[PDB]
């Protein structure tokens, strides 16, 4: 699980741009305030290679 890919972002990356922000992505109207839950998703998702 050391390899993580970003799954949610506001806008597509510009060419050759690194964004390593792990702030919770707000997918709904209600603010998340740094707490993941309903309409609040952690942007990074692991692969889990076996």
């Amino acid at each position, epitope marked *: *699980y050391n390899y993580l890919y970003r799954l949610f972002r506001k806008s597509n990356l510009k060419p050759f741009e690194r964004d390593i922000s*792990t702030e919770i992505y707000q997918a709904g109207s209600t603010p998340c305030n740094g*707490v*993941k839950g309903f309409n609040c998703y952690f942007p*990074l998702q*692991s692969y*889990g290679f076996q």
Partner: antibody
Amino acid sequence: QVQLVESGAEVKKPGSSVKVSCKASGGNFNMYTISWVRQAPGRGLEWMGRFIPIANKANYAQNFPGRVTITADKSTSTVYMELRSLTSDDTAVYYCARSGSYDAFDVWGQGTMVTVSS
Amino acid sequence: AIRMTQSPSTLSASVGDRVTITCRASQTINSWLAWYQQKPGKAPKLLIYDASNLESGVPSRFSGSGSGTEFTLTISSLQPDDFATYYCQQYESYSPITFGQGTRLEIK
């Protein structure tokens, strides 16, 4: 400076169950995995299981089929490891280790002494 | 399940000498191997990761080498503070992780 604090010493009887805690303080809890390592007196370290916060999954050692069930509360960044069917050979210090950055147990908890006897 | 074997299990040496510890695996675990140090009454601390790197804060006298199936931990200048039990991890398969049998270093 990430610091891991566990629960107090636990004294149980054979055939019962125990559940220790590991409070993760500092850093990001959603990326580093917490592994439980036990060490019986006079014996080397032994690995029990891993909790994977990023995938929200829990893994257990092959030598412990169904004996270990690991859960955690991501809101409070506290990891709970449950061991079932305690016996006289389960008297060991149950450390919790953070396999951070390079998959190695860089940060170790203080360790709780779990004693199983009559 | 990958089995880890250490050699020697018990070793004795004096201060300032050279100490070699061999921890041999059963399967090819590439270079995924960590060396620890557990003083009695204390939680083990990481010394070597990836079988060759040095953990931050560890004295430079600790050096690790080897890859594949046989690994080696070597101390250039042994110190009185460096007498403890050293274990080797095999973080190449997470089901289950197998530590070493324990290499206790004693004052000669």
